[PDB]
Amino acid sequence: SGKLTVITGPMYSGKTTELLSFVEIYKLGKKKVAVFKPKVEAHVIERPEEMRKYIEEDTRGVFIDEVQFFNPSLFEVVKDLLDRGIDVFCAGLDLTHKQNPFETTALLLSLADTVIKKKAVCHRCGEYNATLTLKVAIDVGGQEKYIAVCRDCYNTLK
Amino acid sequence: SGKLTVITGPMYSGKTTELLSFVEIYKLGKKKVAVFKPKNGVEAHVIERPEEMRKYIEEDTRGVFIDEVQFFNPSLFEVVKDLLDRGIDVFCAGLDLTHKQNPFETTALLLSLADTVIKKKAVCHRCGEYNATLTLKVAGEEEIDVGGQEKYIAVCRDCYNTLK
Amino acid sequence: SGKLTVITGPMYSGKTTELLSFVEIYKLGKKKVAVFKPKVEAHVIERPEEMRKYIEEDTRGVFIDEVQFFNPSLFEVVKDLLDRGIDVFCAGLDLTHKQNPFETTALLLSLADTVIKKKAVCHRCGEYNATLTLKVAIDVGGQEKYIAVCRDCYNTLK
Amino acid sequence: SGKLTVITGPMYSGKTTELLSFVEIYKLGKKKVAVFKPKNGVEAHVIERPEEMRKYIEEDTRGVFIDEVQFFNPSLFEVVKDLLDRGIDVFCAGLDLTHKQNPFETTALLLSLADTVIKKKAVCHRCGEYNATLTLKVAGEEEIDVGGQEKYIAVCRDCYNTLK
Numbered sequence A, C: 001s002g003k004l005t006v007i008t009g010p011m012y013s014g015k016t017t018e019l020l021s022f023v024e025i026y027k028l029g030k031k032k033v034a035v036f037k038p039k040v041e042a043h044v045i046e047r048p049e050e051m052r053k054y055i056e057e058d059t060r061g062v063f064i065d066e067v068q069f070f071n072p073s074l075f076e077v078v079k080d081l082l083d084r085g086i087d088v089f090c091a092g093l094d095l096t097h098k099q100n101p102f103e104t105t106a107l108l109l110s111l112a113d114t115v116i117k118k119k120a121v122c123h124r125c126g127e128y129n130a131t132l133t134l135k136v137a138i139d140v141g142g143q144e145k146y147i148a149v150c151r152d153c154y155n156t157l158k
Numbered sequence B, D: 001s002g003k004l005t006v007i008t009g010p011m012y013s014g015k016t017t018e019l020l021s022f023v024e025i026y027k028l029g030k031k032k033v034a035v036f037k038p039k040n041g042v043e044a045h046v047i048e049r050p051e052e053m054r055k056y057i058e059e060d061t062r063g064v065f066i067d068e069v070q071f072f073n074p075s076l077f078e079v080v081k082d083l084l085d086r087g088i089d090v091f092c093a094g095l096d097l098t099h100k101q102n103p104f105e106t107t108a109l110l111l112s113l114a115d116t117v118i119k120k121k122a123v124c125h126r127c128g129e130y131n132a133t134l135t136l137k138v139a140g141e142e143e144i145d146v147g148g149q150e151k152y153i154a155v156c157r158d159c160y161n162t163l164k
C-alpha cells in the first residue's frame, strides 16, 4: 500500500522545495507522478474530489502543496490512494496565524506514516527556531502580510 | 519557550516506553517532572479533565508528560499551549487513528502544535513485518473501548484491508 | 532485507530505554530477539564475531547497546545480518568526551536506514539541548565522571 | 552555538534539493549564507581543501551549506566544529556509502557530529519501490569515480544482493 509523508511548519520553512525533493526522486526513478495545488505540471483544482480526473492507472506518486486550503474531504481521498498503492506526499501549514489548527493538515498528520516538521528563521530574533506564523497586516499573501517567528517572539508581539 | 514532542502510532508500537525515555532524561538532569494519564508507572497523576493538570504543576516544573492523550478532552490543546508559553516542555504519547481509521481529535490537534513528531511502528500481527501503522479491532464497533491483545491487533495497511 | 536503526547522542540521553522500546515491539509481535552488550536476557560478549553463536534461524531482531565499545568488525557483522532479513537496532555514543568520533558508531550511522539523535538535559544551563558529554574526573563510569552539556557550555567549561 | 544538519542517502535521493530548501529558509530570513561544493547552483564556491572555506565566510555569515561532502578531506570535521562553536549553523549533504557499501569517511565523521540527520530514500531502479538505500555501479571497480545515470543506479538492499 502507499505511504503518506506530511511536510509542515510555518511559512518561510522551505516546505515547497522539500515537497519538490520528493517529486524529483520519482521522476528520476522513472515513475509517473501527479502534482496538485488549490485554486512539471501542477494541476490547479478546487476540490479533492477532482483529483480522480487526473490520476492514471500507472500514477505512483501524488504530491499536494498548500494542503491547508483543501476540504477535509482530502483525508478520505488520500486514504483511498494509499489503499491503491499510490504514495502521497503533502505540504502545508499546521497552524493559522491565531495558532488554531488547520483542520485538513491535522487530519493528514494523523494519517501520515512520516511527518517532517520544518522550521523557519525567526523574523524578530534571527534564530533558526521559528515554528509559528504571525500576521502583520484564510487570507492569501506573503512577506507583506505574514512573518515567521519563534513562540517567544510571537508572544512578545501579540 | 517550551517545545512539544508528540509520540504516535498504533497499538503495540512502544509509545509509553518511548515517553518514559524522555522522563528519564529529565530525571537524570535534576528537573521536576509531572507525569499524567487519563481516568504507565512512575507516579502518574490520574485526571479526568485537562485543566486538572494546573494543580499538579509547581513553579519549578520543567517537563510535563502525558500518556494516552487520545482519551483527553480537546481542551488539552489550549492547556498545552499555555505550558509551552510558560517555558515548560511537554511530551505526549497517544493513538493517531481509531480502529476504523478515523482520527482521534485530541491527538490530531496536538500533532498540529508539535515541534517534533515521532511516528512509531508496530509488528504486523498477520504478516509479521516491522511495518504496522494501524490498529484493527477483532473482538463491538464502538470507537472508545478499553482493551489489550484480546480485542485489538496492530497491522500494516495491506493486511488491514485484507482482513476488512 | 533487514533495516538498521541507530540511536545515538550523549550520555544521559535515554538511549537504553529507547532501544528497549524497540525490543518491546518485537516481543509484543511474538518475534524472536537477541540482545547484546559489551563486556530479557542480554548476552554479554566481547567481540562482534561472537554474536553468530547466539543468533537463531528464526531470530528476527538483534539489539546492541553500547556499540561504541565494539570492534569496527561490527559493521560487516551487521551488514550480513541485514542481508539475511534480520532487523538491527543499535544504541551508543557518537562522540567521546574530547569530541572525537567513536569509530564503530560512525560506521553504523553510515549504514543506518534510520538515525535517532537523542538529547540530554544540560548539566550547566538546565536546558533540553545537551548534545555532548564532558568529562569531570575509553573509561567506564557515570555521573561521578561524566556530565551531559550543550556545545556552548562545553566550550565554557573546557 | 550552531547546529549541524546532515542529509545523506544514496544517489538519486534528492539530497541537493533538500539542502537548497534550507538555503531558502535563510534567504527568506535575511541572513548571509555561504554555499560550497568540491572541485548545485546559487553561486557555490568551488574548493579543494576544507580550510579554503574560511576565506569565504564573513563576520555576518549565519549559515554554511556544503554539497557532496563525501569528496572533502576529513579535516572538514575540525573545520565544521569550529563554525558550530562560532554560532554558524552548517547544513551538509553527501553520500553515506560507496558503491561497494564501504563508508565514506568524511561523511561518517560528520554523521557523528550532527545534531540532526536526514536519511533520504531513492526509487529502486530494479523493483521500483520507494525503498532504495544503496548505490550500485553498473559501468570500473574504482570507489571515487564521477558520473550519473550511465554509471550508477540506486537500489534497495535486496536488489543490490540480487544484482551482486
Ligand SMILES: Cc1cn([C@H]2C[C@H](O)[C@@H](CO)O2)c(=O)[nH]c1=O
Residues within 6 Å of the ligand: A011, A093, A095, A096, A097, A098, A133, A138, A139, A140, A141, A142, A146
Ligand atoms: C499563516 C496563514 C497563512 N495563510 C495563507 C497565506 C499564504 O498564501 C498561504 C501559505 O503559503 O496560506 C492563511 O490563509 N492563513 C494563515 O493563518
Ligand SMILES: Cc1cn([C@H]2C[C@H](O)[C@@H](CO)O2)c(=O)[nH]c1=O
Residues within 6 Å of the ligand: B011, B068, B095, B097, B098, B099, B100, B135, B143, B144, B145, B146, B147, B148, B152
Ligand atoms: C485502537 C483503539 C484503541 N482504544 C483503546 C484501547 C486501549 O485501551 C487504549 C490504547 O492504549 O486505546 C480505543 O478505545 N479505540 C480504538 O480504536
Ligand SMILES: Cc1cn([C@H]2C[C@H](O)[C@@H](CO)O2)c(=O)[nH]c1=O
Residues within 6 Å of the ligand: C011, C093, C095, C096, C097, C098, C133, C138, C139, C140, C141, C142, C146
Ligand atoms: C563519553 C564517553 C563515555 N565513555 C563510557 C562511559 C560509560 O560507561 C559509557 C557510556 O554509557 O561510555 C567512554 O569510555 N568515553 C567517553 O568519551
Ligand SMILES: Cc1cn([C@H]2C[C@H](O)[C@@H](CO)O2)c(=O)[nH]c1=O
Residues within 6 Å of the ligand: D011, D068, D095, D097, D098, D099, D100, D135, D143, D144, D145, D146, D147, D148, D152
Ligand atoms: C556511489 C558513488 C558515487 N560516486 C560519485 C558519483 C557522483 O559523481 C557523486 C555523487 O553525487 O559521487 C563515487 O565517486 N563513488 C561511489 O561509490
Ligand SMILES: [Zn+2]
Residues within 6 Å of the ligand: A122, A123, A124, A125, A126, A127, A149, A150, A151, A152, A153
Ligand atoms: Zn524569535
Ligand SMILES: [Zn+2]
Residues within 6 Å of the ligand: B124, B125, B126, B127, B128, B129, B155, B156, B158, B159, B160
Ligand atoms: Zn501485514
Ligand SMILES: [Zn+2]
Residues within 6 Å of the ligand: C122, C123, C124, C125, C126, C127, C149, C150, C151, C152, C153
Ligand atoms: Zn548548557
Ligand SMILES: [Zn+2]
Residues within 6 Å of the ligand: D124, D125, D126, D127, D128, D129, D155, D156, D158, D159, D160
Ligand atoms: Zn529493489
